[PDB]
Design a protein around this ligand. Structure first.
Ligand SMILES: *[C@@H]1O[C@@H](CO)[C@@H](O)[C@H](O)[C@H]1NC(C)=O
Ligand SMILES: OC[C@H]1O[C@H](O)[C@@H](O)[C@@H](O)[C@@H]1O
Ligand SMILES: [Zn+2]
Length: 1015
């Protein structure tokens, strides 16, 4: 294994380093507004050294944006693909590249058999070429790496089966900034080349000047370079035709032949395209070749890429003809005029890359190495695209919930082969596709139109239901005596119980377990643990009585705590936000202990009076002017008091102090230790009253945030043996700090209401001496060092927080982990902040044509980890990466992959078993089984099960490692006949494994394995 901590990679371009040196001045560069007047030596190309030009036709198709997926498919995309089929069929020299497999599968599935055969033939012969081949072209900021892999696999699996092809070149022209998570996954999935477009205009200018637009992109911790993927960054402002032939869009627009009038398009530079004829071809070629040669100066080989397309292009018949015919006239003249020393043709992306590497292999060019990311994107001036890190946060949170449900459903059902009647494969495919779709750069980003957002939500809700069905059928099968097991595959044996989605105050969706001495004395519940190690976690259920005790299936008592069910109401009468307690239901909380990748059964039993092993939380309502809060049968009376500072300690854990406003003030790690100042504060950003307005994409604050005026909020304190909390009703936020004896859990019920042109931020203020340094993660995969740059505006210092962020000094670290992607920063030494929601009245001129006014209540969840780090082995000052501690990593897992909870849905579960997976290896804490998926249907003689194994890297801080078992995924299922290492998509075998044993992977590495079994 490479050491990912101690060796700083030597790269030609390191993006943090580059950022620190670059000036970012937005000067008018001339016709190339953000560059300079490119000059070239006309003698550079000659008879023995021509410029080879590849014109690559394309059509950018959004799986939802202004219209829904189905709306665009009917109105645009089906016609684009129908016309691509006809035109490439009829014109053997024409070429086309296709990215979005969601649309292609939809199209192909509907084709008659004759047309399917024509399609396969134009793919086989190289005319139509798939680039990337993911279900979508995903967002790279907010997306979890697990979902990037999911959508990639979904599209490429379809492509393999039906098209007999696996793309090795990637095309990402529209995501708003770019992540190194992409080459990480792609290089581990057989890719050899990738292309990106949306990077900061200053970065384009800088890399162009050094001819560093093509580079070997390696991971920030990769000293050796085996992660490297050849990357082509496009140089200009857009992927559109005007910004792809060369530096001058006034000229380039004249070679978009769709802009002459009849298609209702034109050139904003006031010079139209003209039909090419024998009388203008020479002057037209003069102009075009001059653009090409200027573009070529920015790169190192004699092979030039010329994208030809735009959004939903190549729709009409006549469009194909007008582009093709005019370009071919230009090619015939240009190629036959020796003095140009050019050979131009239509090409695909792979053709371009193949030729580039041929040039490379002939000693013609050597490429620079690079590490780092390409956030935060600005396309012009101070217009930084940090708004979409937060936009539509409800759906961002939903993404993470569905992420886990898909994993849990695939894992739980993978243990068995299923009859076709069970419709397991069907339900899983549906869920994978809907989650995959949401990865689109207008999905999770929250940059789609309101009705499109609703469509994504509906699609995700159906996916959730599908996952629930598969999960509960799987639990019933895994925990029932086989000779008793009697499935009705449409029946609900268990209902899922999710405490945090949609969340208390968002939706009353949770069922109460209804017990009574005259109705039902007891209820079986089951916990699932998708993680490959033994796990304890507190779990809660609603019950119709506070007199309930908990046992395991050996009938051993389990210590439990009962608390009231509190809901917060903005009372329009009193104008306060205050809690009401249920008089008919209660929360029972207990510690579940569940095997690695396994299940554990418990029983909740009613009694007449207080059970021996159940305790009751005290409650304290802090408020001037209190009124009574009756709690039905709850055995302990609510106390009242004037607002005051409070202090709480659960277990042996930290002691937390709170202000009289109910907000964290300090954390004391142990009995003796200092009360370390850690203050939560809620603030608000506004919008500019003139100049550019914030929208779904852009964050353009009118200065630093101002404190939310809190008034005298109502604070509710609940104190229990197992769990305590402080909740406070703030304007727009019910803020909750929960304690269970380790790092606190934070929950925000965020309802921005009708507060227009407001962004709500949650800030942490400490005295940690972090200076201008902070760390944020990329796609839940890695943590990257950020440096606050005061030479950049506030919105430029905002970064994606897809899963976590931290600050540290020599001695102390504060880490905030999230259960949802949001935007955030550290705008001053000792601070962390993260945006909660934003409501914007105006459009920000990127095509959406609307503000963001469709906010809905969302339960944000976090863990807050204060640690001493003076004993930790950290990377040197010059290393671009950071690493979590064991505790911070476990905290992230608790948010993203909690125990799943199942309530048995009938009165009696006949043949119930107590446990599943007690013999599963409990693997080292840094290792995860990210994916377990059965890859064959029941009729396959040889069964195959695919596993994705990921190892993170945790800091060595002097905690001795616990004894753990080697995890060999190929022996998790019986009767193994083969173990293969594969690409991460499972589509290519890379290594036949001796002894049928799957090795564990190295820190920061990800491997895939497929075990084969005799049926
Ligand atoms: C898939 O493509 C090829 C491998 O590159 C052929 O070897 C193989 O026959 C093909 N499968 C077909 C054409 O059905
Ligand atoms: O301007 C932002 C915008 O870029 C492109 O035009 C699109 O195709 C969209 O997906 C995206 O939202
Ligand atoms: Zn797009």
């Amino acid at each position: 294994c490479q050491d990912v901590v101690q060796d700083v990679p030597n790269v030609d371009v390191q993006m943090l380093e580059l950022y620190d040196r670059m000036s970012f001045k937005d000067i008018d560069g001339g016709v190339w507004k953000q560059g300079w007047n490119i000059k070239y030596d006309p003698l550079k190309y000659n008879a023995h050294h021509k410029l080879k030009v590849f014109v690559v036709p394309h059509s950018h198709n959004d799986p939802g944006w202004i219209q829904t997926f189905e709306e665009y498919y009917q109105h645009d995309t089906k016609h684009i693909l129908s016309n691509a089929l006809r035109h490439l069929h009829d014109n053997p020299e024409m070429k086309f590249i296709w990215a979005e497999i969601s649309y292609f599968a939809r199209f192909y599935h509907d084709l008659g058999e004759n047309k399917k055969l024509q399609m396969k033939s134009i793919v086989k012969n190289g005319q139509l070429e798939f680039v990337t081949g993911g279900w979508v072209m995903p967002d790279e900021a907010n997306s979890h790496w697990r979902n990037v892999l999911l959508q990639l696999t979904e599209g490429q699996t379809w492509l393999k089966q039906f098209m007999n092809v696996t793309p090795t070149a990637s095309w990402a022209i529209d995501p708003f900034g770019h992540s190194p998570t992409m080459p990480y996954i792609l290089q581990k999935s057989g890719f050899k080349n990738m292309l990106i477009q949306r990077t900061h205009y200053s970065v384009k200018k800088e890399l162009a000047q050094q001819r560093q637009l093509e580079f070997l992109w390696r991971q920030i911790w990769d000293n050796k370079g085996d992660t490297a993927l050849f990357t082509h960054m496009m140089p200009f402002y857009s992927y559109d035709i005007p910004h792809t032939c060369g530096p001058d869009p006034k000229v380039c627009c004249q070679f978009d032949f769709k802009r002459m009038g009849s298609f209702g398009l034109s050139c904003p530079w006031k010079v139209p395209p003209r039909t090419i004829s024998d009388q203008n071809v020479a002057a037209r070629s003069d102009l075009l070749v001059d653009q090409w040669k200027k573009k070529a100066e920015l790169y190192r080989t004699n092979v030039l890429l010329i994208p030809l397309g735009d959004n939903f292009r190549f729709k009409q018949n006549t469009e194909w003809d007008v582009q093709r015919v005019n370009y071919e006239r230009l090619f015939e003249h240009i190629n036959s005029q020796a003095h140009f020393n050019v050979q131009a043709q239509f090409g695909t992306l792979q053709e371009y890359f193949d030729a580039v590497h041929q040039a490379e292999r002939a000693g013609q060019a050597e490429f620079p190495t690079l590490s780092g990311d390409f956030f935060t994107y600005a396309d012009r001036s101070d217009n930084y695209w940090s708004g979409y890190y937060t936009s539509r946060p409800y759906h961002k949170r939903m993404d993470r919930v569905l992420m886990h449900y898909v994993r849990a459903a695939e894992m739980l059902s993978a243990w068995h082969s299923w009859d076709g009647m069970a419709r397991i494969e069907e339900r899983l495919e549906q869920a994978r596709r809907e989650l995959s779709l949401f990865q689109h750069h207008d999905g999770i980003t929250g940059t789609a139109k309101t009705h499109v957002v609703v469509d994504y939500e509906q699609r995700m809700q159906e996916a959730l239901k599908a996952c629930q069905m598969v999960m509960q059928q799987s639990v019933y099968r895994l925990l029932t005596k086989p000779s008793i097991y009697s499935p009705d595959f449409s029946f609900s044996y268990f209902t899922l119980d999710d405490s945090r989605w949609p969340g208390s105050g968002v939706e009353d969706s949770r069922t109460t377990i209804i017990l009574g001495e005259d109705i039902l004395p007891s209820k079986h519940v089951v916990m699932h643990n998708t993680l490959p190690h033994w796990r304890e976690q507190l779990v809660d259920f609603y019950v119709s009585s506070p007199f309930v005790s908990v046992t395991d299936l050996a009938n051993n008592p389990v210590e439990a705590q009962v608390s009231p069910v509190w809901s917060w109401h903005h009372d329009t009468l009193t104008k306060t936000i205050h809690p009401q307690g249920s008089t008919t239901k209660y929360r029972i909380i207990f510690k579940a202990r569940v095997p690695p990748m396994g299940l554990a059964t418990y029983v909740l039993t009613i009694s007449d009076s207080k059970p021996e092993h159940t305790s009751y939380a005290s409650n304290l309502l802090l408020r001037k002017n209190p009124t009574s809060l009756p709690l039905g049968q709850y055995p302990e009376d609510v106390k009242f008091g004037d607002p005051r500072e409070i202090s709480l300690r659960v277990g042996n854990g930290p002691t937390l102090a709170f202000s009289e406003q109910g907000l964290l003030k300090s954390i004391q790690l142990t009995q003796d230790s200092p009360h370390v100042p850690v203050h939560f504060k809620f603030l608000k950003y506004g919008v500019r009253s003139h100049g550019d307005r914030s929208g779904a994409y852009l964050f353009l604050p009118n200065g630093p945030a101002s404190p939310v005026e809190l008034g005298q909020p109502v604070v509710l304190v609940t104190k229990g043996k197992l769990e305590s909390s402080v909740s406070v009703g703030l304007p727009s936020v019910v803020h909750q700090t929960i304690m269970r004896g380790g790092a606190p859990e934070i929950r925000n019920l965020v309802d921005i209401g009708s507060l227009d042109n407001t962004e709500i931020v949650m800030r942490l203020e400490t005295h940690i001496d972090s200076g201008d340094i902070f760390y944020t993660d990329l796609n839940g995969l890695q943590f990257i060092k950020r440096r606050r740059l005061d030479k950049l505006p506030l919105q430029a210092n905002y970064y994606p927080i897809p899963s976590g962020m931290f600050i540290e000094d020599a001695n102390t670290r504060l880490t905030l982990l999230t259960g949802q992607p949001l935007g955030g920063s550290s705008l001053a030494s000792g601070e962390l902040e993260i945006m909660q929601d934003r409501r914007l009245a105006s459009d920000d001129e990127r095509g959406l044509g609307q503000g963001v006014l469709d906010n809905k209540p969302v339960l944000h969840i976090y863990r807050l980890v204060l640690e001493k780090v003076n004993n930790c082995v950290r990377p040197s000052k010059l290393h671009p990466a950071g690493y979590l501690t064991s505790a911070a990593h476990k905290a992230s897992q608790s948010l993203l992959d909690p125990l799943d909870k199942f309530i048995f849905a009938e009165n009696e579960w006949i043949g119930a078993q107590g446990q599943f997976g007690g013999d599963h290896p409990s693997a080292r804490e840094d290792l995860d089984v990210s994916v377990m998926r059965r890859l064959t249907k029941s009729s396959a003689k040889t069964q195959r099960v695919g596993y994705v194994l990921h190892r993170t890297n945790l800091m060595q801080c002097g905690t001795p490692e616990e004894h753990t078992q080697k995890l060999d995924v190929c022996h998790l299922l019986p009767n193994v006949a083969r173990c293969e290492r594969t690409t991460l998509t499972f589509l290519q075998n890379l290594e036949h494994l001796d002894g049928m044993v799957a090795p564990e992977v190295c820190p920061m590495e990800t491997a895939a394995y497929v075990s084969s079994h005799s049926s």
